[PDB]
Amino acid sequence: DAEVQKNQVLTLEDWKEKWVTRHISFHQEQGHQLLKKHLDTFLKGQSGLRVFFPLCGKAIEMKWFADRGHTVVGVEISEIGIREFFAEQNLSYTEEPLAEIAGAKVFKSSSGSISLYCCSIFDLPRANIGKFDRIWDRGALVAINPGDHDRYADIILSLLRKEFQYLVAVLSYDPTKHAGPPFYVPSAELKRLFGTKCSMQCLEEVDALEERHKAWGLDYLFEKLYLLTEK
Ligand SMILES: Nc1ncnc2c1ncn2[C@@H]1O[C@H](CSCC[C@H](N)C(=O)O)[C@@H](O)[C@H]1O
């Protein structure tokens, strides 16, 4: 069952077409409510953290971190989504080509609080973006093709400082009922991916079934939030 979606794929071009055609149902216009609940503690006592958002879309919470004085980096293959982030958050920005990745670009807020790399996360290591105190992962690990999970996890691990907090949101549902994204990523997979190098703790399990999931086929959907930290 954890293997049912093992061969499913969305490509980089499919994701870019979703943005062009406005198939962006993943986006949360009010921001993620579990992060909101856990944010203070996530940041508790710390100043000027470097925070990474994989597969960031136009995630409005990048502004939450930037407003609190933390440095934010995201990676997103869609230039449309990146430009929409800055428009929606009312921020000016520069654009620079990325010399190490053909065709790619980096978009930075005017005083540098937020830098969004327009490229694949699988190419991002060549952009020399350093390491992070915090990672917020929502619609990211669950968006990655299942076949790419090992590669994805090693990149996330390579981006962590020695001390870190890594919050990851997954969704539990019957994967024989729906072909992702968002893919089904159970606890056991999280543990396969990160548990030798991370301590884990489940923080939350919440009902996410919306009737919009009805015709999907789903009669259960729960969102789970995990906190990963140094072993
Ligand atoms: N390999 C990849 N590299 C970079 N972005 C990718 C990617 N695969 C998918 N994406 C982008 O990943 C996003 C997943 S949808 C979730 C967006 C955002 N994290 C949110 O919480 O709203 C899309 O914006 C899609 O274009």
UniProtKB/Swiss-Prot annotation:
Domain of life from the UniProt record:
Eukaryota
Q: GO biological process annotations for this chain's record?
A: methylation
Q: What is its EC number?
A: 2.1.1.67
Q: Where does S-adenosyl-L-methionine bind?
A: 15-26, 55, 76, 120-121, 138
Q: Give the catalysed reaction(s), semicolon-separated.
A: S-adenosyl-L-methionine + a thiopurine = S-adenosyl-L-homocysteine + a thiopurine S-methylether; mercaptopurine + S-adenosyl-L-methionine = 6-methylthiopurine + S-adenosyl-L-homocysteine + H(+)
Asked whether the keyword Transmembrane helix is assigned, the reply is no
Where along the chain is substrate bound?
F26
Q: Where in the cell is it found?
A: Cytoplasm
One Pfam family this chain carries? TPMT
Q: Which organism is it from?
A: Mus musculus (Mouse)
* Subunit: Monomer.
What family, per the record?
Belongs to the class I-like SAM-binding methyltransferase superfamily. TPMT family.
The protein's matches in Gene3D superfamilies, at most eight in alphabetical order, are given as: Vaccinia Virus protein VP39
Disulfides per UniProt: none
Q: What does this protein do?
A: Catalyzes the S-methylation of thiopurine drugs such as 6-mercaptopurine (also called mercaptopurine, 6-MP or its brand name Purinethol) using S-adenosyl-L-methionine as the methyl donor. TPMT activity modulates the cytotoxic effects of thiopurine prodrugs. A natural substrate for this enzyme has yet to be identified.
Instruction: List modified residues, type N6-acetyllysine.
Output: K44
Coiled-coil-forming residues are none
Q: Keywords in UniProt for this one?
A: Acetylation, Cytoplasm, Methyltransferase, Phosphoprotein, S-adenosyl-L-methionine, Transferase
Task: Please list the residues that carry the modification Phosphoserine.
Answer: S25
Please give one Gene Ontology molecular function term for this protein.
Answer: thiopurine S-methyltransferase activity
| CC terms in the record's Gene Ontology section | cytoplasm
Q: Which HAMAP family match?
A: Thiopur_methtran (MF_00812)
User: What InterPro entries does the record point to?
Assistant: SAM-dependent_MTases_sf, Thiopurine_S-MeTrfase, TPMT
Name this polypeptide is given: Thiopurine S-methyltransferase
